[PDB]
C-alpha cells in the first residue's frame, strides 16, 4: 500500500537550513529563518515566560484534560487583546474563542469549520503570502486564489491593482488579510486603506479572515490591531486566527487561538458548537503549558509589565537593524536605493535580489536568504552588518 | 454565512459531566469520566513527571520550533517501547515516528496521510469502539464500518463472530485494533487469538492500525504490546498511533506518536515525507513540553524507575477495585453474576445495565455512568464501594 506509490517535495524554507550549517566558513550568515534572534544570534526564552513557568511548576495540581476550547481566561485575554477592553463584540457576547496549537492550527480549524458547515468553497490570499497558507486551506477542501498586493518594481502596495482584483471575488468568499504586517513583504495598509477594504467587504459579501501573528511587532500591541478593529466594527461576521509564538517566544509550545465574531450571541454559539466538533475530530483538546503561560502573564500586572517590555525590546531591535542595514549598504556599496527596508515593519522583508543573486550569496559568500529575496532582518547582529553588506554589494 | 445555518449535538461522554456537579447530594459518585482517579478521587501529576519538569525549567535555553516529526529521542523511545529493544523493525530502519498532539492527533494524521497518499477508502472499527474513532476517520474523508467483537449476553469476544465478519473486508482496507485492551468492554484477545488475526491480515490484505492508549494498564509495559508485536512480525506495513496521556498522567499536555512500519527503509522514508506534509498542513510542528517530559524520564534510569513504579501503582489499584466491586455486589445484593468485571483489564468496563438502569442511577441515587453501562472502575474509591453497590443492587 505504501510501496513505491508515494512522493516528496521540500516546503521551501525548511530546505534552506540543513544546506547551511554544512558550510564551516563559518557558514557565516543565515537569514530567512522564521524566528527572531537577538544581539548574539540566539532565540532565548523570555524572562517573563520563565517566571510564569516556575509559577506553574509550583501550582499545577493536575494535568487532566482541557475543554475543547481551551482555557477560559486565555480566551478572555486574547479577545481583549484583539478587540480592546470594552469592545462591544466581547460583551454583546458576539465573539467566541478556541485555543488552538498555533497560528497554523487555528487556520486549519477555521478552514475545516468553514469547509463543512458553510457554503465557502474559495479563499483569497495575497501575492505573495505565507507559503503554508495555500496547503492549509487546500487541505480542508477549499480553493485558494490570489489577489495582487505588491510589486517589486515600486516596492509597495498597489492599492489600485488590489481593490481592482478583489472585485472577482463573489459574495460567499473568504478574503484573508494579515492584521499586523505582511509576510514576506513587510508592507503596511494605512488605517485609511483598511477603512476602505472594510467598507468593500460589508457592501460586497466576503467573510474577513485575519491572520494575526506579528502583534506588537510593527508599532505596538494596541496600534497594530486597529486594522482588524476597523474591520471588526462594520462587520457582523469575522474569523481571526492568532499566534502567540513570535511575540511571546513560545514557538515550540504551540499556542494561538481561533476566534469568530458572528452577529449575536445566539448564533456565535450555534456556530462555535460545530467549530468545537471540528477540534474534537482533529487534536481533541489543546496543549495546556504554553497557553497557560500566556494566560497567567497577561493576567498579572507585574509579569505583563515585564513581558510588554520584552515585546518593546524585540520590536526596537528590528527597527534599529533596518537603519543599520539600509545605510551600511549606503556606506559600503553605492549601487541602489534600498531605502524601503526602513519603514517596512516586522522581521521579514524583500531585498530586491534575483534568484541568481540569492544563489550568488549562498554558495561562496556565506549569506543564506530564501530564493524570493526575503531576508529576516532580526537575523542581523550588529557584527553581521558590514560583512553582510559585503556580499549584497558584491552582487549589487 | 454562519447565520441560523448551523447545528449541535453533544459527544456523549462530555455531556455527562455538567449534568452532575449540579447535584449537591453530594452528587456522590461520577463514574464514566475518561481519566483515572486514586484513593481520594483526584487525578495528580506524577512525581516522576514533576521531577522532569524542574529539570526542564532548569535546562531550556530556547523555545524555538520543533521539526515536524518532533523530538528525536522521543521517537527512539516510543518505537523502542512499542517493538522491543532490538526489534529488527527499529534497525533495518523500517519504522519512522512522528510526535503528535495526543492519541487523537495521531489517528487523524494517519487518516489524513492515508486519505491522500493511498488507495484506502474504508476502515473497520470494533463494536463498540471509542466514540471518537468514527468522527476522526470520517473527517479525513474515509468511511468507517463495524466488525463484531463482543456481545452482551455472554460477556466476552465472539472470536467466531469476529473473524466471520472481517471476511467482508477487502484487500485495500484498514482494520483498527486496540493493542492493550479495549474501550469500553475491557476484553482481551489472547496471544493465540492475536496470532490468528495476524495471519489473516497477511494472507488477506488489510493494513493494521493499532490504537495504543493503555500501555502498561492491563498487564505490564512489555506484556501488553505483545499483541502489536505478534502483528509486527508477519507484517511489512503497519501504523500505530500511541498515547502517553493516561499512563503518564499527561492528559492536557497532548502527547502521543504516529509511527509507521513500511517494509524497507527506502519506502518508510518516501511514505514518511507525505506523512510529514500532512502535519505541516495540520498543526505544523508538535507541543514540546509534555513530550520532552516523556523523553527525559524514559532516557533516565532513575526517573524511569520511579515512573514504572507509578505505572505499576495505577494498574494495581484498578485491579484491586474490580475485586472490591464484584464481591461487594456479592456481599450486599445477591441478584446476578457480575464476575466478568474481574479479569477484564484497564479502567473501563461494561456493567450489564439497561439504559433505564443508567437513568435510574443518575437521577436520585447519585451514580453517574455513561448510557452504555460503561463504568470507569478507576473512579471507585475504597469508600465509594458500599454506597456504589447500593444503587446497583437497588436496580439489580
Ligand atoms: C508564523 C505565522 C503563522 C503561524 O505560525 P504558528 O507557528 O502556527 O504560530 C501564520 N501566519 C503567518 C503569516 C505567520 O508568519
Ligand atoms: C484515550 C484514547 C485515545 C486518545 O486520546 P488522547 O487524549 O488523544 O491521547 C485513543 N484511543 C482510545 C481507545 C483511547 O482510550
PDB file of N, CA and C in Angstrom, chain A residues 45-117:
ATOM      1  N   UNK A  45      14.443  32.180  25.805  1.00  0.00           N
ATOM      2  CA  UNK A  45      13.138  32.006  26.366  1.00  0.00           C
ATOM      3  C   UNK A  45      12.947  33.223  27.240  1.00  0.00           C
ATOM      4  N   UNK A  46      11.888  34.000  27.013  1.00  0.00           N
ATOM      5  CA  UNK A  46      11.610  35.234  27.730  1.00  0.00           C
ATOM      6  C   UNK A  46      11.630  35.095  29.232  1.00  0.00           C
ATOM      7  N   UNK A  47      12.212  36.092  29.921  1.00  0.00           N
ATOM      8  CA  UNK A  47      12.320  36.109  31.380  1.00  0.00           C
ATOM      9  C   UNK A  47      10.920  36.082  31.969  1.00  0.00           C
ATOM     10  N   UNK A  48       9.990  36.829  31.361  1.00  0.00           N
ATOM     11  CA  UNK A  48       8.620  36.809  31.797  1.00  0.00           C
ATOM     12  C   UNK A  48       8.007  35.444  31.593  1.00  0.00           C
ATOM     13  N   UNK A  49       8.186  34.678  30.498  1.00  0.00           N
ATOM     14  CA  UNK A  49       7.513  33.379  30.435  1.00  0.00           C
ATOM     15  C   UNK A  49       8.220  32.457  31.400  1.00  0.00           C
ATOM     16  N   UNK A  50       9.521  32.637  31.630  1.00  0.00           N
ATOM     17  CA  UNK A  50      10.296  31.810  32.539  1.00  0.00           C
ATOM     18  C   UNK A  50       9.754  31.929  33.961  1.00  0.00           C
ATOM     19  N   UNK A  51       9.359  33.127  34.401  1.00  0.00           N
ATOM     20  CA  UNK A  51       8.780  33.295  35.721  1.00  0.00           C
ATOM     21  C   UNK A  51       7.429  32.616  35.861  1.00  0.00           C
ATOM     22  N   UNK A  52       6.587  32.770  34.831  1.00  0.00           N
ATOM     23  CA  UNK A  52       5.277  32.156  34.770  1.00  0.00           C
ATOM     24  C   UNK A  52       5.333  30.649  34.703  1.00  0.00           C
ATOM     25  N   UNK A  53       6.448  30.086  34.250  1.00  0.00           N
ATOM     26  CA  UNK A  53       6.683  28.645  34.225  1.00  0.00           C
ATOM     27  C   UNK A  53       7.046  28.055  35.593  1.00  0.00           C
ATOM     28  N   UNK A  54       7.759  28.779  36.479  1.00  0.00           N
ATOM     29  CA  UNK A  54       8.011  28.279  37.833  1.00  0.00           C
ATOM     30  C   UNK A  54       6.711  28.415  38.596  1.00  0.00           C
ATOM     31  N   UNK A  55       5.975  29.511  38.390  1.00  0.00           N
ATOM     32  CA  UNK A  55       4.667  29.672  38.984  1.00  0.00           C
ATOM     33  C   UNK A  55       3.776  28.473  38.688  1.00  0.00           C
ATOM     34  N   UNK A  56       3.930  27.859  37.519  1.00  0.00           N
ATOM     35  CA  UNK A  56       3.134  26.720  37.105  1.00  0.00           C
ATOM     36  C   UNK A  56       3.634  25.483  37.767  1.00  0.00           C
ATOM     37  N   UNK A  57       4.927  25.225  37.675  1.00  0.00           N
ATOM     38  CA  UNK A  57       5.534  24.078  38.322  1.00  0.00           C
ATOM     39  C   UNK A  57       5.189  23.984  39.818  1.00  0.00           C
ATOM     40  N   UNK A  58       5.084  25.163  40.465  1.00  0.00           N
ATOM     41  CA  UNK A  58       4.635  25.339  41.833  1.00  0.00           C
ATOM     42  C   UNK A  58       3.168  25.036  42.040  1.00  0.00           C
ATOM     43  N   UNK A  59       2.287  25.557  41.194  1.00  0.00           N
ATOM     44  CA  UNK A  59       0.858  25.404  41.357  1.00  0.00           C
ATOM     45  C   UNK A  59       0.034  24.348  40.599  1.00  0.00           C
ATOM     46  N   UNK A  60       0.549  23.604  39.637  1.00  0.00           N
ATOM     47  CA  UNK A  60      -0.293  22.625  38.985  1.00  0.00           C
ATOM     48  C   UNK A  60      -0.485  21.401  39.827  1.00  0.00           C
ATOM     49  N   UNK A  61      -1.728  21.200  40.154  1.00  0.00           N
ATOM     50  CA  UNK A  61      -2.062  20.057  40.962  1.00  0.00           C
ATOM     51  C   UNK A  61      -2.715  18.923  40.196  1.00  0.00           C
ATOM     52  N   UNK A  62      -2.763  19.098  38.870  1.00  0.00           N
ATOM     53  CA  UNK A  62      -3.343  18.136  37.949  1.00  0.00           C
ATOM     54  C   UNK A  62      -2.926  18.455  36.514  1.00  0.00           C
ATOM     55  N   UNK A  63      -2.846  17.405  35.688  1.00  0.00           N
ATOM     56  CA  UNK A  63      -2.676  17.558  34.248  1.00  0.00           C
ATOM     57  C   UNK A  63      -3.844  16.908  33.507  1.00  0.00           C
ATOM     58  N   UNK A  64      -5.070  16.934  34.058  1.00  0.00           N
ATOM     59  CA  UNK A  64      -6.240  16.410  33.377  1.00  0.00           C
ATOM     60  C   UNK A  64      -6.776  17.380  32.329  1.00  0.00           C
ATOM     61  N   UNK A  65      -7.439  16.755  31.361  1.00  0.00           N
ATOM     62  CA  UNK A  65      -7.926  17.406  30.153  1.00  0.00           C
ATOM     63  C   UNK A  65      -8.619  18.751  30.245  1.00  0.00           C
ATOM     64  N   UNK A  66      -8.207  19.490  29.225  1.00  0.00           N
ATOM     65  CA  UNK A  66      -8.742  20.791  28.913  1.00  0.00           C
ATOM     66  C   UNK A  66     -10.080  20.641  28.157  1.00  0.00           C
ATOM     67  N   UNK A  67     -10.975  21.630  28.223  1.00  0.00           N
ATOM     68  CA  UNK A  67     -12.162  21.634  27.386  1.00  0.00           C
ATOM     69  C   UNK A  67     -11.671  21.922  25.983  1.00  0.00           C
ATOM     70  N   UNK A  68     -12.420  21.519  24.982  1.00  0.00           N
ATOM     71  CA  UNK A  68     -12.023  21.666  23.589  1.00  0.00           C
ATOM     72  C   UNK A  68     -11.602  23.061  23.141  1.00  0.00           C
ATOM     73  N   UNK A  69     -12.222  24.024  23.794  1.00  0.00           N
ATOM     74  CA  UNK A  69     -11.955  25.429  23.535  1.00  0.00           C
ATOM     75  C   UNK A  69     -10.853  26.124  24.360  1.00  0.00           C
ATOM     76  N   UNK A  70     -10.260  25.324  25.257  1.00  0.00           N
ATOM     77  CA  UNK A  70      -9.054  25.695  25.981  1.00  0.00           C
ATOM     78  C   UNK A  70      -9.259  26.226  27.376  1.00  0.00           C
ATOM     79  N   UNK A  71      -8.478  27.257  27.695  1.00  0.00           N
ATOM     80  CA  UNK A  71      -8.541  27.924  28.984  1.00  0.00           C
ATOM     81  C   UNK A  71      -9.445  29.146  28.860  1.00  0.00           C
ATOM     82  N   UNK A  72     -10.412  29.287  29.753  1.00  0.00           N
ATOM     83  CA  UNK A  72     -11.313  30.421  29.834  1.00  0.00           C
ATOM     84  C   UNK A  72     -10.779  31.829  29.838  1.00  0.00           C
ATOM     85  N   UNK A  73      -9.771  32.044  30.661  1.00  0.00           N
ATOM     86  CA  UNK A  73      -9.223  33.367  30.811  1.00  0.00           C
ATOM     87  C   UNK A  73      -8.222  33.592  29.718  1.00  0.00           C
ATOM     88  N   UNK A  74      -7.653  32.532  29.132  1.00  0.00           N
ATOM     89  CA  UNK A  74      -6.786  32.673  27.964  1.00  0.00           C
ATOM     90  C   UNK A  74      -7.644  33.239  26.827  1.00  0.00           C
ATOM     91  N   UNK A  75      -8.905  32.784  26.751  1.00  0.00           N
ATOM     92  CA  UNK A  75      -9.854  33.242  25.756  1.00  0.00           C
ATOM     93  C   UNK A  75     -10.239  34.695  25.963  1.00  0.00           C
ATOM     94  N   UNK A  76     -10.484  35.000  27.236  1.00  0.00           N
ATOM     95  CA  UNK A  76     -10.876  36.331  27.658  1.00  0.00           C
ATOM     96  C   UNK A  76      -9.790  37.373  27.444  1.00  0.00           C
ATOM     97  N   UNK A  77      -8.551  36.915  27.595  1.00  0.00           N
ATOM     98  CA  UNK A  77      -7.386  37.721  27.344  1.00  0.00           C
ATOM     99  C   UNK A  77      -7.111  37.939  25.882  1.00  0.00           C
ATOM    100  N   UNK A  78      -7.237  36.906  25.028  1.00  0.00           N
ATOM    101  CA  UNK A  78      -6.953  37.033  23.601  1.00  0.00           C
ATOM    102  C   UNK A  78      -8.039  37.866  22.934  1.00  0.00           C
ATOM    103  N   UNK A  79      -9.336  37.713  23.212  1.00  0.00           N
ATOM    104  CA  UNK A  79     -10.352  38.611  22.665  1.00  0.00           C
ATOM    105  C   UNK A  79     -10.124  40.026  23.156  1.00  0.00           C
ATOM    106  N   UNK A  80      -9.705  40.206  24.410  1.00  0.00           N
ATOM    107  CA  UNK A  80      -9.448  41.537  24.934  1.00  0.00           C
ATOM    108  C   UNK A  80      -8.210  42.186  24.389  1.00  0.00           C
ATOM    109  N   UNK A  81      -7.342  41.351  23.849  1.00  0.00           N
ATOM    110  CA  UNK A  81      -6.139  41.845  23.222  1.00  0.00           C
ATOM    111  C   UNK A  81      -6.474  42.226  21.783  1.00  0.00           C
ATOM    112  N   UNK A  82      -7.325  41.432  21.134  1.00  0.00           N
ATOM    113  CA  UNK A  82      -7.648  41.680  19.749  1.00  0.00           C
ATOM    114  C   UNK A  82      -8.572  42.857  19.507  1.00  0.00           C
ATOM    115  N   UNK A  83      -9.606  42.983  20.334  1.00  0.00           N
ATOM    116  CA  UNK A  83     -10.673  43.951  20.137  1.00  0.00           C
ATOM    117  C   UNK A  83     -10.685  45.195  20.989  1.00  0.00           C
ATOM    118  N   UNK A  84      -9.953  45.186  22.097  1.00  0.00           N
ATOM    119  CA  UNK A  84      -9.976  46.306  23.011  1.00  0.00           C
ATOM    120  C   UNK A  84     -10.578  45.862  24.330  1.00  0.00           C
ATOM    121  N   UNK A  85     -10.680  46.767  25.318  1.00  0.00           N
ATOM    122  CA  UNK A  85     -11.167  46.439  26.661  1.00  0.00           C
ATOM    123  C   UNK A  85     -12.659  46.302  26.719  1.00  0.00           C
ATOM    124  N   UNK A  86     -13.353  47.321  26.199  1.00  0.00           N
ATOM    125  CA  UNK A  86     -14.802  47.329  26.236  1.00  0.00           C
ATOM    126  C   UNK A  86     -15.377  47.219  24.847  1.00  0.00           C
ATOM    127  N   UNK A  87     -14.666  46.531  23.941  1.00  0.00           N
ATOM    128  CA  UNK A  87     -15.159  46.344  22.585  1.00  0.00           C
ATOM    129  C   UNK A  87     -16.502  45.638  22.695  1.00  0.00           C
ATOM    130  N   UNK A  88     -17.538  46.221  22.065  1.00  0.00           N
ATOM    131  CA  UNK A  88     -18.891  45.694  22.228  1.00  0.00           C
ATOM    132  C   UNK A  88     -19.043  44.271  21.747  1.00  0.00           C
ATOM    133  N   UNK A  89     -18.076  43.779  20.957  1.00  0.00           N
ATOM    134  CA  UNK A  89     -18.060  42.400  20.497  1.00  0.00           C
ATOM    135  C   UNK A  89     -17.981  41.458  21.717  1.00  0.00           C
ATOM    136  N   UNK A  90     -17.030  41.749  22.643  1.00  0.00           N
ATOM    137  CA  UNK A  90     -16.780  40.973  23.869  1.00  0.00           C
ATOM    138  C   UNK A  90     -18.054  40.800  24.672  1.00  0.00           C
ATOM    139  N   UNK A  91     -18.656  41.920  25.071  1.00  0.00           N
ATOM    140  CA  UNK A  91     -19.947  41.786  25.679  1.00  0.00           C
ATOM    141  C   UNK A  91     -20.966  42.685  24.961  1.00  0.00           C
ATOM    142  N   UNK A  92     -21.707  41.682  24.482  1.00  0.00           N
ATOM    143  CA  UNK A  92     -22.764  41.528  23.492  1.00  0.00           C
ATOM    144  C   UNK A  92     -22.649  40.043  23.087  1.00  0.00           C
ATOM    145  N   UNK A  93     -21.519  39.475  23.548  1.00  0.00           N
ATOM    146  CA  UNK A  93     -21.133  38.099  23.501  1.00  0.00           C
ATOM    147  C   UNK A  93     -21.186  37.488  22.128  1.00  0.00           C
ATOM    148  N   UNK A  94     -20.830  38.418  21.233  1.00  0.00           N
ATOM    149  CA  UNK A  94     -20.773  38.238  19.791  1.00  0.00           C
ATOM    150  C   UNK A  94     -19.490  37.521  19.345  1.00  0.00           C
ATOM    151  N   UNK A  95     -18.535  37.326  20.255  1.00  0.00           N
ATOM    152  CA  UNK A  95     -17.285  36.687  19.922  1.00  0.00           C
ATOM    153  C   UNK A  95     -17.043  35.468  20.770  1.00  0.00           C
ATOM    154  N   UNK A  96     -16.602  34.358  20.171  1.00  0.00           N
ATOM    155  CA  UNK A  96     -16.224  33.139  20.894  1.00  0.00           C
ATOM    156  C   UNK A  96     -14.809  32.678  20.511  1.00  0.00           C
ATOM    157  N   UNK A  97     -14.018  32.146  21.485  1.00  0.00           N
ATOM    158  CA  UNK A  97     -12.609  31.743  21.274  1.00  0.00           C
ATOM    159  C   UNK A  97     -12.157  30.326  21.668  1.00  0.00           C
ATOM    160  N   UNK A  98     -11.526  29.676  20.682  1.00  0.00           N
ATOM    161  CA  UNK A  98     -10.981  28.347  20.809  1.00  0.00           C
ATOM    162  C   UNK A  98      -9.468  28.405  20.757  1.00  0.00           C
ATOM    163  N   UNK A  99      -8.819  27.965  21.848  1.00  0.00           N
ATOM    164  CA  UNK A  99      -7.372  27.848  21.968  1.00  0.00           C
ATOM    165  C   UNK A  99      -6.997  26.715  21.051  1.00  0.00           C
ATOM    166  N   UNK A 100      -5.913  26.926  20.330  1.00  0.00           N
ATOM    167  CA  UNK A 100      -5.505  26.045  19.254  1.00  0.00           C
ATOM    168  C   UNK A 100      -3.985  25.796  19.334  1.00  0.00           C
ATOM    169  N   UNK A 101      -3.410  24.709  18.783  1.00  0.00           N
ATOM    170  CA  UNK A 101      -1.981  24.540  18.582  1.00  0.00           C
ATOM    171  C   UNK A 101      -1.254  25.415  17.566  1.00  0.00           C
ATOM    172  N   UNK A 102      -1.214  26.715  17.821  1.00  0.00           N
ATOM    173  CA  UNK A 102      -0.503  27.654  16.980  1.00  0.00           C
ATOM    174  C   UNK A 102      -1.407  28.481  16.084  1.00  0.00           C
ATOM    175  N   UNK A 103      -0.791  29.301  15.258  1.00  0.00           N
ATOM    176  CA  UNK A 103      -1.486  30.094  14.277  1.00  0.00           C
ATOM    177  C   UNK A 103      -1.891  29.137  13.186  1.00  0.00           C
ATOM    178  N   UNK A 104      -1.012  28.225  12.740  1.00  0.00           N
ATOM    179  CA  UNK A 104      -1.292  27.229  11.710  1.00  0.00           C
ATOM    180  C   UNK A 104      -2.429  26.334  12.146  1.00  0.00           C
ATOM    181  N   UNK A 105      -2.467  25.925  13.424  1.00  0.00           N
ATOM    182  CA  UNK A 105      -3.541  25.087  13.964  1.00  0.00           C
ATOM    183  C   UNK A 105      -4.931  25.735  13.948  1.00  0.00           C
ATOM    184  N   UNK A 106      -4.940  27.072  14.048  1.00  0.00           N
ATOM    185  CA  UNK A 106      -6.163  27.875  14.042  1.00  0.00           C
ATOM    186  C   UNK A 106      -6.736  28.158  12.645  1.00  0.00           C
ATOM    187  N   UNK A 107      -5.827  28.154  11.666  1.00  0.00           N
ATOM    188  CA  UNK A 107      -6.105  28.414  10.273  1.00  0.00           C
ATOM    189  C   UNK A 107      -6.733  27.161   9.684  1.00  0.00           C
ATOM    190  N   UNK A 108      -6.240  25.986  10.060  1.00  0.00           N
ATOM    191  CA  UNK A 108      -6.842  24.756   9.606  1.00  0.00           C
ATOM    192  C   UNK A 108      -8.195  24.639  10.279  1.00  0.00           C
ATOM    193  N   UNK A 109      -8.306  24.857  11.592  1.00  0.00           N
ATOM    194  CA  UNK A 109      -9.586  24.738  12.308  1.00  0.00           C
ATOM    195  C   UNK A 109     -10.704  25.605  11.720  1.00  0.00           C
ATOM    196  N   UNK A 110     -10.323  26.797  11.250  1.00  0.00           N
ATOM    197  CA  UNK A 110     -11.236  27.731  10.647  1.00  0.00           C
ATOM    198  C   UNK A 110     -11.656  27.076   9.354  1.00  0.00           C
ATOM    199  N   UNK A 111     -10.637  26.782   8.544  1.00  0.00           N
ATOM    200  CA  UNK A 111     -10.814  26.153   7.253  1.00  0.00           C
ATOM    201  C   UNK A 111     -11.597  24.861   7.324  1.00  0.00           C
ATOM    202  N   UNK A 112     -11.554  24.081   8.412  1.00  0.00           N
ATOM    203  CA  UNK A 112     -12.334  22.867   8.492  1.00  0.00           C
ATOM    204  C   UNK A 112     -13.735  23.220   8.929  1.00  0.00           C
ATOM    205  N   UNK A 113     -13.966  24.254   9.745  1.00  0.00           N
ATOM    206  CA  UNK A 113     -15.319  24.568  10.191  1.00  0.00           C
ATOM    207  C   UNK A 113     -16.121  25.078   9.021  1.00  0.00           C
ATOM    208  N   UNK A 114     -15.462  26.018   8.338  1.00  0.00           N
ATOM    209  CA  UNK A 114     -15.907  26.611   7.102  1.00  0.00           C
ATOM    210  C   UNK A 114     -16.217  25.545   6.056  1.00  0.00           C
ATOM    211  N   UNK A 115     -15.255  24.657   5.802  1.00  0.00           N
ATOM    212  CA  UNK A 115     -15.408  23.596   4.826  1.00  0.00           C
ATOM    213  C   UNK A 115     -16.605  22.674   4.974  1.00  0.00           C
ATOM    214  N   UNK A 116     -17.188  22.507   6.164  1.00  0.00           N
ATOM    215  CA  UNK A 116     -18.275  21.551   6.363  1.00  0.00           C
ATOM    216  C   UNK A 116     -19.563  22.186   6.780  1.00  0.00           C
ATOM    217  N   UNK A 117     -19.469  23.338   7.421  1.00  0.00           N
ATOM    218  CA  UNK A 117     -20.643  23.974   7.994  1.00  0.00           C
ATOM    219  C   UNK A 117     -21.006  25.259   7.308  1.00  0.00           C
TER     220      UNK A 117
END
